[PDB]
Amino acid sequence: VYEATPFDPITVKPSDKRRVAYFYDADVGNYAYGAGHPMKPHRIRMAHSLIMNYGLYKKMEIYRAKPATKQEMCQFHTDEYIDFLSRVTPDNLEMFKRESVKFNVGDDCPVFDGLYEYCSISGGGSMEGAARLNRGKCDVAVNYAGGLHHAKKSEASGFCYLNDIVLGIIELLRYHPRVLYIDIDVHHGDGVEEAFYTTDRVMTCSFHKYGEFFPGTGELRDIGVGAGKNYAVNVPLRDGIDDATYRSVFEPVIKKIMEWYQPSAVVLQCGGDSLSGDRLGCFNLSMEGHANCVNYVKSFGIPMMVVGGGGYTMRNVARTWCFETGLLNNVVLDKDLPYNEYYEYYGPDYKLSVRPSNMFNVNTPEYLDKVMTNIFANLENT
Amino acid sequence: NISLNEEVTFFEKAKRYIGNKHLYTEFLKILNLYSQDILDLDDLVEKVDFYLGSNKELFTWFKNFVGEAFGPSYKRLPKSDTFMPCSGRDDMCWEVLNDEWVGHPVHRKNQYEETLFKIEEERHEYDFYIESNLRTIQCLETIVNKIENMTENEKANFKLPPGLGHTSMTIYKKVIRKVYDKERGFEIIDALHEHPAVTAPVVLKRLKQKDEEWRRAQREWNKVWRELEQKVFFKSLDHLGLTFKQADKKLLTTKQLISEISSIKVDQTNKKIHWLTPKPKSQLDFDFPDKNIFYDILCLADTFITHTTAYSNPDKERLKDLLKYFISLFFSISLLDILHQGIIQNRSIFNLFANTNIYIFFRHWTTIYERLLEIKQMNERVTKEINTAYKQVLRLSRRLINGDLEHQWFEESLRQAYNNKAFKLYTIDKVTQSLVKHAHTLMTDAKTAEIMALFVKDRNASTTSAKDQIIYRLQVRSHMSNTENMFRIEFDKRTLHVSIQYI
Amino acid sequence: NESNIISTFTRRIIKEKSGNKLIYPEATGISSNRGNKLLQRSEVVTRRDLNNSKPMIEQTVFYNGSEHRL
Amino acid sequence: LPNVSSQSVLAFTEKHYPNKLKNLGTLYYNRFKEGSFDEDSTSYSDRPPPFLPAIGIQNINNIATLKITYEDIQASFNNIESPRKRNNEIWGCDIYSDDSDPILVLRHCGFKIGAPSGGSFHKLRRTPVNVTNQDNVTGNLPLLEGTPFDLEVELLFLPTLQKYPSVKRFDITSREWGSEATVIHDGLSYGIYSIVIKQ
Ligand SMILES: [Zn+2]
């Protein structure tokens, strides 16, 4: 059942002030994807600089996750694919062209310097966040260096080489009975969704733009297969969704499933390409709307890990990640940008808030009502 | 001028080879037609094959001179395809993961958003160049400080293996090739690898100078980047505010209005896709419920006539009354009156048959009108919401045509009044000027004058007949070219509704 | 009508060399490549790949012996 | 005279798609709206997409009956009030992508209104995808011009083609796709399978 709910300003919940472990490494920001490439790890450095200059380090414990080894990566990936990934270099691709065409590397997954190091550091960040969330040493792991979900068991697509999300999920499943996964990225989490179709332990919900878009998968009928039936929900949307519409289509589904599924642990992707003015996105969310999902998920008092993917315009993703990091500490942000290295890149007004665009929303209320109708109908089975 | 005399000589040779004055003039006509960007290159070469095809060498010069499945999106992998060994998988990873099912696949951005993306990309490219230069400078500095302490004997046989002790051997190569030229980059890299003792200090000095030069260049470009962002970012919020602006710019062309009716006819009524019901008589439906939207628009018109640069006072005094005349004659509102079995008594349905000019004027009238009829249902709502307006928008639109208010503030004035409800009131001046110009071209033309006289005579009769309509059509067609597209307008007094139909 | 016409043809044919009616709008922000082949550029985007920033990649003009990213 | 024989695609489809041919259903031609499998309502007004719809990989090598009205053929032939014809929305050579206009595709195959040309015409290939009958044009066209006869068109959907060359056949200059600067097409391909003339 879908009902229209106007958006309201975000206020933190002082009920809980759980520990926040913001994993970060200073060498991730050095790697580059190309010249005209939209995907830039430099946005992680932008967000970290914004956090540092903002005064948020006194609350959160900053770490530096150890890079993962090949044996750890073999927990989910194949030995051949990870071997090719480690061996491939931007120079010897001619000798590796057979694997490049076989493993789909080169078109949307360019080979660059330290690519295996990038994959290793992201996998290690997710692994250490899961390890901290499993030992009870923390309750929120902001692994902004991860957020790589498009990668599959033996393929790399969508600027996504190593699926660190499923590795962290397996680590959580080491001692947790059931785990749950959320998405906010405009695209679809094909690899993460596919990784746990036939089993009940993991659920994969994605709020993905559907139709003629990059993943092209994740319809409303992707119920599951075998014993994992009704345990993989999907919420396809359309172009131009706004903050209130996103909240109304997000919150009831999560409430219903955690009433039914009853997760023991939670992971939340935080794709920053679903904002206004985005380069590869088609939404109209704002930082308030983006932070609404993470605040709502955190308000349920469950062990959650926030990862960071997407984001192809520097200012939007940087501000959104800073706002999410602040709200994870139950602290509202100043919403004024302090001077730092990248002060010149933050618009002509130098304000943290970015105004969402005026573009025409497409999501009809009756279509959303029917969509959540099928979602609730299939979730009611279990 | 260096590469023109050769072409002059080639064309002289071609003219001499043709030898015929008339054929040469025809070839000149062909090349002039191509010069107007109307003839394709393939068409041009196929045409010149007829003339210069006899001479193979001249033709070659010309040619080289002008150029089991489960689920909707998931398919079960076969038994043989399920074996991709992974050594890191334990018992839980085997039990709780899947290896038998694999998924299979089955808006125009604003120009200013594109400009912002380009600006951001340029800034990031400069930043990446500067950061790579910094890393290479640090690497060369540590190499220089390591070699300076080293003795002369080790300096002589000092060889630099590829990599330079860096986390990425390709990081410094790009910086070196950027500082130098692409042809000398490989040579400089080889010299660094083979003669580090003499190469490292000078290359480090070059990098040190280029860092300062590039930083100064970036800070100089930042002025223009700041100005661009300041003057473009505010505009880069209204996706509907600019797309509809260009749509209104491109819409009111003479061909487009008749294109709408012809398209709707040929799509719905003429084609009869259903093939079950007869085609409807009319195409479009319009309503004129409010009459207070007439005096204000007439005042806007009189403002334009009193402010227009190119119009004569004897023409202006006529225009000041023509609009009153059409409103009084068409909507029955307030020869001397004119200057100021089918027989049905007391007719309420009237027909107006005219050419493209009257149709275009009526379409301009209706396009201006439906912009104001939509805000009728929202005036009270926005008046309620603003303090949690018709006079305000009227007086704000007054000051543009007379020149009191500049064009810019009009767009932002309505933004706060209507966030997304109103996005069609931003180009009132253009449609109003189009309407007044079309009224002028209606009055000036003699054929249009005869059409309006025939319409006056037809409307002055309170009773119509079957033969009277045919006589009216024949009379309007007598001075009318057959090739011109025929339209018809019917106005219903009972419901104050005006309908149109394409003939 | 002859010397001017040959000069104009030579100018218009040498302008294209050495690098550079509805005109159609540029296609930026579409990941379909189904019915948008008509639009300007849009030959480098497709549903298969994620990148769609290629259409707005700046072009170059060689003026005074050097390129300029317009 | 540009000639592309193109027998590789059909043999490839035969070997790799042994599924039986099936008639998906009748398709009614439209001029401004995306096609559909229904006829109850064909109106849409909002404040030119390709007529053919998305077929999907699972529906490769299938027959989709397409019905074309005579008035649309008239309007497209002399380029009067036809967005697709003025836009030259034609791509392919005897095998055309899903975005190519069906009328321009049929014209590109050798179809011509009125009586057949009296010249020394070569062996027509109006149905190249139908290797069984490369000129499967049944029925008698009306001798008198202007007589409205409806065309029943059978289209065989084919897998994606690597490149769509640009040729000038029957005074039609189709646009070029699949070159090195361009990218691999995502939609399927189709051609004229069978033609039956209906009065
Ligand atoms: Zn994404």
Whole-number Å distance between alpha carbons of D135 and D128:
8
Set of chain A residues whose Cβ sits within 8 Å of the Cβ of B101: 194, 197-198, 225
What is the count of residue pairs from A and B with beta carbons less than 8 Å apart?
149
Set of chain C residues whose Cβ sits within 8 Å of the Cβ of D177: 37, 43
Considering the domain boundaries, does residue A109 fall inside one? Answer: yes
Q: Between chains, do B237 and A357 touch, taking CB under 8 Å as contact? A: yes
Q: Between chains, do B233 and A347 touch, taking CB under 8 Å as contact? A: yes
Tell me the backbone φ, ψ of residue B176, rounded to 5 degrees: -65, -45
Closest D-chain CA to C47: D186
Distance D178 CA to ligand 1 centre (A): 27
Token pair, residue B419, equals 């966030």
The residues, any chain, with a CB within 8 Å of residue C45's CB and separated by 6 or more, are C27, C30, C31, C33, C51, C52, C54, C55, D183
CB C50 within 8 Å of CB A280: yes
Active site (annotated) includes residue A188: no
Per-residue buried b or exposed e for B44-67, using 16+ beta carbons within 10 Å of the residue's own CB: bbebbeebbeeeeebbebbeeebe
Set of chain A residues whose Cβ sits within 8 Å of the Cβ of C52: 38, 279-280
The residues, any chain, with a CB within 8 Å of residue D10's CB and separated by 6 or more, are D129, D131, D158
Q: Which residue type sits at B458?
A: D
DSSP state of D133: -
Q: Between chains, do D75 and B274 touch, taking CB under 8 Å as contact? A: no
**Secondary element (H or E) of residue B99:** none
Set of chain D residues whose Cβ sits within 8 Å of the Cβ of C47: 186
The residues, any chain, with a CB within 8 Å of residue B117's CB and separated by 6 or more, are A279, A313, C53, C56
Considering the domain boundaries, does residue A183 fall inside one? Answer: yes
Q: Resolution of this PDB entry, in A?
A: 3.5
Distance from CA of A328 to the nearest CA of B (A): 29
Closest C-chain CA to D34: C35
Q: Between chains, do C56 and B34 touch, taking CB under 8 Å as contact? A: no
Report chain breaks in chain B, C–N > 2.5 Å, as residues after which they occur: 67, 106, 334, 340, 388
First to last CA, chain A: 18
Tell me the backbone φ, ψ of residue A180, rounded to 5 degrees: -135, 145
Name the percent of chain C in helix, strand, coil, to the closest 5: 25, 10, 65
Measuring CA to CA, how many Å separate A141 from each of A23, A62, A290, B368?
7, 10, 18, 58
Establish if C58 touches chain B: CB-CB under 8 angstroms: yes
Beta-strand pair B487-492/B497-502: antiparallel
Let me know if B204 is exposed, middle or buried by CB neighbors in 10 A (0-12, 13-18, 19+).
middle
Tell me the backbone φ, ψ of residue A45, rounded to 5 degrees: -65, -40
CB C41 within 8 Å of CB D194: no
Query: In 10 A of CB B128, how many CB atoms?
Result: 16
Distance from CA of D66 to the nearest CA of C (A): 19
Identify the experimental approach: cryo-EM
Tell me the backbone φ, ψ of residue B27, rounded to 5 degrees: -65, -40
Distance B332 CA to ligand 1 centre (A): 61
Q: Between chains, do D42 and B42 touch, taking CB under 8 Å as contact? A: no
Distance A282 CA to ligand 1 centre (A): 11
Distance from CA of B265 to the nearest CA of A (A): 28
DSSP state of A337: P
Q: Between chains, do D81 and B42 touch, taking CB under 8 Å as contact? A: no
Residue whose token pair is 């008339």 = B22
Closest A-chain CA to C31: A213
Least CB-CB distance to C29: which of B8, B65, B108? B108
DSSP state of B482: T
Set of chain C residues whose Cβ sits within 8 Å of the Cβ of B31: 5-6, 9
Considering the domain boundaries, does residue A206 fall inside one? Answer: yes
Distance A12 CA to ligand 1 centre (A): 27
Q: Which residues pair with B102 in a beta bridge?
A: B75
Distance from CA of C41 to the nearest CA of A (A): 16
Total count of domains within chain A: 1
Given the residues A48, A149, A150, A187, select the one marked as catalytic.
Answer: A150
CB A142 within 8 Å of CB A304: no
Q: Between chains, do C12 and B35 touch, taking CB under 8 Å as contact? A: yes
Q: Which chains, if any, share at least 3 CB pairs under 8 A with chain A?
A: B, C
DSSP state of D27: E
Distance from CA of B460 to the nearest CA of A (A): 48
Measuring CA to CA, how many Å separate B95 from each of A196, A292, B98?
10, 36, 8
Closest A-chain CA to B134: A30
Whole-number Å distance between alpha carbons of C2 and B25:
9
Token pair, residue D122, equals 């070569």
Per-residue buried b or exposed e for B164-195, using 16+ beta carbons within 10 Å of the residue's own CB: beeebbebbbbbbbbbbeeeebeebbeebeee
Set of chain A residues whose Cβ sits within 8 Å of the Cβ of B242: none
Let me know if C12 is exposed, middle or buried by CB neighbors in 10 A (0-12, 13-18, 19+).
middle
Per-residue buried b or exposed e for B441-466, using 16+ beta carbons within 10 Å of the residue's own CB: ebeeeeebeebbebbeebbeeeebee
The residues, any chain, with a CB within 8 Å of residue A67's CB and separated by 6 or more, are A117, A120, A121, A123, A124
Considering the domain boundaries, does residue A7 fall inside one? Answer: no
Set of chain C residues whose Cβ sits within 8 Å of the Cβ of D98: 34
Token pair, residue D137, equals 């044009």
**Secondary element (H or E) of residue B269:** none
Q: Between chains, do C49 and D177 touch, taking CB under 8 Å as contact? A: no
The 3-state secondary structure of D99-114 reads CCCHHHHHHHCCCCCC
Per-residue buried b or exposed e for A138-163, using 16+ beta carbons within 10 Å of the residue's own CB: bbbbbbbbbbbbbbbbbbbbbbbbbb
Angle at D101 between CA D97 and CA D102, to 5 degrees: 95
Q: Which residue type sits at A16?
A: D
Q: Between chains, do A27 and B106 touch, taking CB under 8 Å as contact? A: no
Token pair, residue B9, equals 């000589």
* Domain carrying residue A41: 20-380
Whole-number Å distance between alpha carbons of D193 and D96:
12
Considering the domain boundaries, does residue A14 fall inside one? Answer: no
Q: DSSP labels for D41-94?
A: ----------SS----GGG-S-EEEEEE-HHHHHHHHTTSS-HHHHHT--BBSS
Rg (CA), chain A: 20
Distance A41 CA to ligand 1 centre (A): 14
What is the count of residue pairs from A and C with beta carbons less than 8 Å apart?
36
Measuring CA to CA, how many Å separate A325 from each of A207, A335, B439?
21, 13, 63
Distance from CA of A170 to the nearest CA of C (A): 28
Considering the domain boundaries, does residue A339 fall inside one? Answer: yes
Distance A271 CA to ligand 1 centre (A): 6
Query: In 10 A of CB B502, how many CB atoms?
Result: 21
Let me know if C18 is exposed, middle or buried by CB neighbors in 10 A (0-12, 13-18, 19+).
exposed
Distance C54 CA to ligand 1 centre (A): 17
CB B172 within 8 Å of CB B136: yes
Least CB-CB distance to C31: which of A38, A214, A312? A214
Set of chain B residues whose Cβ sits within 8 Å of the Cβ of A282: 107
Whole-number Å distance between alpha carbons of B52 and B45:
10
Considering the domain boundaries, does residue A90 fall inside one? Answer: yes
Measuring CA to CA, how many Å separate B141 from each of A188, A193, B198?
46, 49, 14
Q: For the packed helices B356-373 and B446-459, what is the interaxial angle rounded to 10 degrees?
A: 70
Token pair, residue B443, equals 């009055």
Q: Between chains, do D91 and C37 touch, taking CB under 8 Å as contact? A: yes
Give the CATH number for residue A208: 3.40.800.20
Distance A314 CA to ligand 1 centre (A): 14
Measuring CA to CA, how many Å separate B231 from each of A327, B123, B234, C57, D144?
33, 17, 7, 21, 65
Distance A153 CA to ligand 1 centre (A): 19
Considering the domain boundaries, does residue A10 fall inside one? Answer: no
Distance from CA of B242 to the nearest CA of C (A): 14
CA dihedral B219, B223, B224, B230 (to 10 degrees): 130
Set of chain D residues whose Cβ sits within 8 Å of the Cβ of C45: 183
Whole-number Å distance between alpha carbons of A219 and A223:
9
Let me know if B271 is exposed, middle or buried by CB neighbors in 10 A (0-12, 13-18, 19+).
buried
Residue B352: CA count within 13 A, CB half-sphere = 24
Whole-number Å distance between alpha carbons of A304 and A321:
16
Least CB-CB distance to B113: which of A219, A277, A349? A277
Q: Which residue type sits at D25?
A: G
Q: Which chains, if any, share at least 3 CB pairs under 8 A with chain D?
A: B, C
Residues 153-212 of B with CB under 8 A from A: 167-171
